Please model this.
Amino acid sequence: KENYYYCGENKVALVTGAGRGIGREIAKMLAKSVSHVICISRTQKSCDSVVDEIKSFGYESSGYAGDVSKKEEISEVINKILTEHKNVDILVNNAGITRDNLFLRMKNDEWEDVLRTNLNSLFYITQPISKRMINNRYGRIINISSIVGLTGNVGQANYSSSKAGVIGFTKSLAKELASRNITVNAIAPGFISSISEQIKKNIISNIPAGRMGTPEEVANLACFLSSDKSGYINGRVFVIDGGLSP
Amino acid sequence: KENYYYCGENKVALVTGAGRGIGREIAKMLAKSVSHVICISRTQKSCDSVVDEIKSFGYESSGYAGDVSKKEEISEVINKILTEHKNVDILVNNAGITRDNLFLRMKNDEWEDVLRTNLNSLFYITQPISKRMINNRYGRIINISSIVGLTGNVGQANYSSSKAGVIGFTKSLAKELASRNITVNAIAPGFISSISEQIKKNIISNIPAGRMGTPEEVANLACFLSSDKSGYINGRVFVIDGGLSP
Amino acid sequence: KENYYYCGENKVALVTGAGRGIGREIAKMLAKSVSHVICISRTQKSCDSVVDEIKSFGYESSGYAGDVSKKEEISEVINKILTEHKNVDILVNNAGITRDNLFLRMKNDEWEDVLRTNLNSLFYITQPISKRMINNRYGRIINISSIVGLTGNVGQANYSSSKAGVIGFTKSLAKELASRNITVNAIAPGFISSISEQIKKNIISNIPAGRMGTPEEVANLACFLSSDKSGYINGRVFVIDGGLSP
Amino acid sequence: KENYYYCGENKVALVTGAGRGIGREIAKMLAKSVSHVICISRTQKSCDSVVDEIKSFGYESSGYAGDVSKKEEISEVINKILTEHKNVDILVNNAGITRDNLFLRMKNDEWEDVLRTNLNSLFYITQPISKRMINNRYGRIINISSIVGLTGNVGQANYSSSKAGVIGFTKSLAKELASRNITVNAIAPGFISSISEQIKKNIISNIPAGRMGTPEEVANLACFLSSDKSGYINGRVFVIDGGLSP
Model:
């Protein structure tokens, strides 16, 4: 009673921020149909946890600790992965953080850390991988953005700027890489489970669906985009938010 | 080597404009996972053809002739379908036409027929069906629009107006029906196969993917939206255009 | 202490639905800088009222009764206007109605009347006028849509469909007419003054600006778009909503 | 034969990247209706040039050299400006650069410099100024983005990411500052004059208007947004591109 996503043969996927939530469910679901799923988490403990969960189901997976906010460090991790794997066919850029505050109160580090972690990081991770995808003439790049990147949100000028940036990145790369059978798309989740009970009720009262979404629902959308039959979807932003913001 | 879309148990789908192209592929693909697929085409000959194709594969299907541009006629067809079927869980509003012309030359009937067929029709088909979905607390409504409904197009002021209207319809209904476990979304295809060879080459030269899409690709997206695991996607427009217009 | 909009020399403007609200303020403000403002209202009494108001300030204005929902009637009114005036340089398509109801309860006439009045009418009014603009190589067409045409709204599936359609019309015509120095743009107002006090407070509580907009504010935007210096703005939708829906 | 933009009484405007092009025309046009226009350019020579041009017309203007890509330096410049001026009522964030390259060839510094200059800079410039606007309960913040921030562009993954980020920033701040009578909007220019003649012809052939826009046209839009009567326009992106991308 679940969908099956055929992603092609002998494929390797790489998911950043795979230690928890959406990233973790994406890595676990991709494992059902790709030959090997690489998990990157800030700490080795975090990725080992998800890699173990994936392996316990009989699938192949490996994990590398990597802090995407540190360009030299993450660049080395990706280089290492590419020496071990000739190709990385599916890349899910999910790593990201929030450092919320009204703009008037926001600290310079809250602004910088969110932009650096959520946006600047895409270059260091995606460039080496895209080079291999171009050479192999195949790829699926899925960038996790947020509905806040489309609408803005009180207390999140930094997060919104970063996630809107993810969308501009996505569209430009789609234009450049599509001729090589590479699709580049973004997923913009709304309120996904995993805040005071009163604020949560306030939020849910604004969602037509009447509930928050689940990380498994987001993973379904990411695996659909990673599949073989989604090759004509390119440069788009797919919002999964229960009707919060049509 | 294909995706499998679990759409739930004992489901009935209805696809309009099912006689050819996108509509036909959507009806055929839905048949792989729904209990019964109802096909509506302008002529009984057209729907019998697709119903026969679906049945030849061992699936259940029935067909009703119905001209969506004639409100009294299509309203009766839908009423008949609902007397025979208690529920229609998935509705794909695909029927539509084009009557191209530069605005300066466009005839009043070219304007009227396209709006009436492509937009006014949605009310007569969707209202009775949505009443059953609300009572049953379940539904998937997929409206086929077009990238032209988002960007406009020379020679298609009528088509663009109609397809943009489909999107406004989609978003309003998503807001009203989501609490009853009904999702309402639109698919906006770009250039899908099925024009002079020179104009076709001109078009393809504007598509990053370097080719037109196939009706089977559009059907994959419609079946994904019809699936059980896409219940949190609501009120959205999903563009499938090979990167033509990010 | 007000803006001045230079709209060119010897210009004639035509505003539909000029009898009240936004339409009335647009006609009055355009009068400050165009040579003649033609007002169309459903009844002769309504347009005479605004024409008198405009004339009382020393400006030139004339009025024609015309029901935009009746194609034969409005087509004759426009033909008459064009026999009296060689050119109509600025056209503001503002006429429109609402017939609100949840989709489940909506009557066929509520659906039809709103689409016919708000969308089908654009063809009969704009086509003859655009022919003169093309011949004269100059024009400003401003179509009033609504934020509901962009986001959808509970109880307004008909209005939203119609106003989204206005946007598709706008973009297609912009593509076709821009080479003739004609701009075609839409204005999408949010909540504009002119509902229970409790629902109004509920609405205002959702507007960052903390108040409804005024018809004079919408008129300022329409006159800016009608001005000489806005010739490079084309095929766009300008939302004036106090931040209600970024 | 020009528009007049009433921007209120005793207002002070600040324009970054005021040394040439769009920024220069915005500063010059604002000077016609604000009491004092502050110009910031990377070099003191550049801003002195525009300040002299503005003063030669009888208006008040001052200039400060400031490199927006250097956070400590630009933060000090803004602090200095705010010690000299109690209020800065209008802020036009126009400073920005391009460092074009296909993603595969792009250098890490080309990615970093564009994001740092075009996006990270907004925090250091806008935060101190917004604090004064909140205290004074009045403001106009206009952020210059680009159509590339909406559509992406081959060879500009860095620029597109930065300019899309500007839009996310704009929408979040609009939500936070609107209650204090502060509007925050973005302008997304298309191809503005000031490339091989063949590529330029190729570009112009894609613009319905059949020409590039002028910096004076962009300035008109910025001054309209800075005016008193545009207080209900908030959190929007206004595209000025001759119909290039509806």
Observations:
- Chain D has eight helices and seven strands.
